[PDB]
Enzyme design. Sequence first.
Site, mmCIF file in Angstrom:
data_model
loop_
_atom_site.group_PDB
_atom_site.id
_atom_site.type_symbol
_atom_site.label_atom_id
_atom_site.label_comp_id
_atom_site.label_asym_id
_atom_site.label_seq_id
_atom_site.Cartn_x
_atom_site.Cartn_y
_atom_site.Cartn_z
ATOM 1 N N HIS A 117 -22.590 -38.101 -65.953
ATOM 2 C CA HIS A 117 -23.962 -38.402 -65.562
ATOM 3 C C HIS A 117 -24.899 -38.330 -66.777
ATOM 4 O O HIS A 117 -25.662 -39.257 -67.031
ATOM 5 C CB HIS A 117 -24.398 -37.410 -64.466
ATOM 6 C CG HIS A 117 -25.816 -37.574 -64.014
ATOM 7 N ND1 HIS A 117 -26.153 -38.201 -62.830
ATOM 8 C CD2 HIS A 117 -26.983 -37.162 -64.566
ATOM 9 C CE1 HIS A 117 -27.468 -38.180 -62.683
ATOM 10 N NE2 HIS A 117 -27.994 -37.562 -63.725
ATOM 11 N N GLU A 118 -24.842 -37.230 -67.523
ATOM 12 C CA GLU A 118 -25.736 -37.030 -68.660
ATOM 13 C C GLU A 118 -25.493 -38.098 -69.733
ATOM 14 O O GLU A 118 -26.441 -38.628 -70.307
ATOM 15 C CB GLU A 118 -25.570 -35.631 -69.260
ATOM 16 C CG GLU A 118 -25.961 -34.476 -68.335
ATOM 17 C CD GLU A 118 -27.455 -34.443 -67.979
ATOM 18 O OE1 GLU A 118 -28.255 -35.178 -68.593
ATOM 19 O OE2 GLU A 118 -27.834 -33.680 -67.064
ATOM 20 N N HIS A 121 -27.014 -41.426 -68.858
ATOM 21 C CA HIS A 121 -28.430 -41.445 -69.252
ATOM 22 C C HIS A 121 -28.586 -41.778 -70.734
ATOM 23 O O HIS A 121 -29.441 -42.577 -71.117
ATOM 24 C CB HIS A 121 -29.086 -40.083 -69.031
ATOM 25 C CG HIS A 121 -29.505 -39.818 -67.620
ATOM 26 N ND1 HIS A 121 -30.175 -40.745 -66.853
ATOM 27 C CD2 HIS A 121 -29.384 -38.709 -66.846
ATOM 28 C CE1 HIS A 121 -30.434 -40.229 -65.664
ATOM 29 N NE2 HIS A 121 -29.961 -38.995 -65.635
ATOM 30 N N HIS A 127 -31.472 -43.071 -62.842
ATOM 31 C CA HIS A 127 -30.911 -42.663 -61.578
ATOM 32 C C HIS A 127 -30.630 -43.858 -60.669
ATOM 33 O O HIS A 127 -31.317 -44.890 -60.713
ATOM 34 C CB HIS A 127 -31.802 -41.635 -60.907
ATOM 35 C CG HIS A 127 -31.719 -40.290 -61.553
ATOM 36 N ND1 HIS A 127 -32.772 -39.407 -61.583
ATOM 37 C CD2 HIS A 127 -30.702 -39.689 -62.213
ATOM 38 C CE1 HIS A 127 -32.414 -38.321 -62.245
ATOM 39 N NE2 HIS A 127 -31.163 -38.469 -62.636
ATOM 40 N N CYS A 128 -29.589 -43.699 -59.864
ATOM 41 C CA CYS A 128 -29.070 -44.764 -59.029
ATOM 42 C C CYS A 128 -29.049 -44.262 -57.598
ATOM 43 O O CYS A 128 -28.766 -43.090 -57.363
ATOM 44 C CB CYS A 128 -27.649 -45.086 -59.486
ATOM 45 S SG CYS A 128 -26.843 -46.387 -58.571
ATOM 46 N N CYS A 132 -22.645 -43.308 -56.487
ATOM 47 C CA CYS A 132 -22.504 -43.478 -57.919
ATOM 48 C C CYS A 132 -22.730 -42.160 -58.616
ATOM 49 O O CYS A 132 -23.569 -41.365 -58.191
ATOM 50 C CB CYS A 132 -23.530 -44.523 -58.385
ATOM 51 S SG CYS A 132 -23.603 -44.857 -60.175
ATOM 52 N N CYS A 151 -21.037 -47.067 -59.975
ATOM 53 C CA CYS A 151 -21.013 -48.205 -59.056
ATOM 54 C C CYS A 151 -20.925 -49.493 -59.896
ATOM 55 O O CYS A 151 -21.126 -49.448 -61.107
ATOM 56 C CB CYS A 151 -22.276 -48.213 -58.187
ATOM 57 S SG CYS A 151 -23.796 -48.653 -59.102
ATOM 58 N N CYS A 154 -24.058 -50.130 -62.195
ATOM 59 C CA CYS A 154 -24.199 -49.289 -63.377
ATOM 60 C C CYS A 154 -23.093 -49.606 -64.393
ATOM 61 O O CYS A 154 -23.341 -49.639 -65.588
ATOM 62 C CB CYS A 154 -24.214 -47.799 -63.000
ATOM 63 S SG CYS A 154 -25.728 -47.272 -62.117
HETATM 64 ZN ZN LIG Z 1 -24.954 -46.766 -60.001
HETATM 65 ZN ZN LIG Z 2 -30.014 -37.517 -64.104
#
Ligand SMILES: [Zn+2]
Ligand SMILES: [Zn+2]
Length: 158
Positions: A117-118, A121, A127-128, A132, A151, A154
């Site tokens: 996640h990080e 970014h 953010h989604c 995802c 997803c 992304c």
């Molecule tokens: Zn996504």
């Molecule tokens: Zn985040």
Amino acid sequence: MKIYIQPLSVNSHTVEVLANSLPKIFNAEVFVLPASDVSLKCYNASRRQYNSTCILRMLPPIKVTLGVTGKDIYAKGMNFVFGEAELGGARAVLSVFRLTTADSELYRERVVKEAVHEIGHVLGLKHCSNNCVMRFSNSVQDVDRKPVSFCRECASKI
Ligand SMILES: [Zn+2]
Ligand SMILES: [Zn+2]
């Protein structure tokens, strides 16, 4: 793309988990830097937490650098944060403090999800709201519910 993991007061098992999973996920070479202690400059004695932004700003601004700490961290206006990333920048930090659990496999999945996640970014993803890894997680329960995968939208952007 290369990813540099900076251990900061975190056990070596947590680091190995990321070293082994991140390379295939991102098709990037991953390097582990020598462990060091998270800086007391970033400690907030009142809260007994470290400030995520202060930790982030002490990492080298080299894309992609991920600091990983075992200490609990917060950001301005937050009880706690799981981490913090420069959106479209170079650096991110992840704390595994809020992720700990005696279920070792569950812990592994949480660590990998939040690292992914990080780094997402850092690579420019916001953010989604799809199913995802880039979904915002309000608590660990939410981390457990989102998938480790991007997803189709992304994935197409990175
Ligand atoms: Zn996504
Ligand atoms: Zn985040």
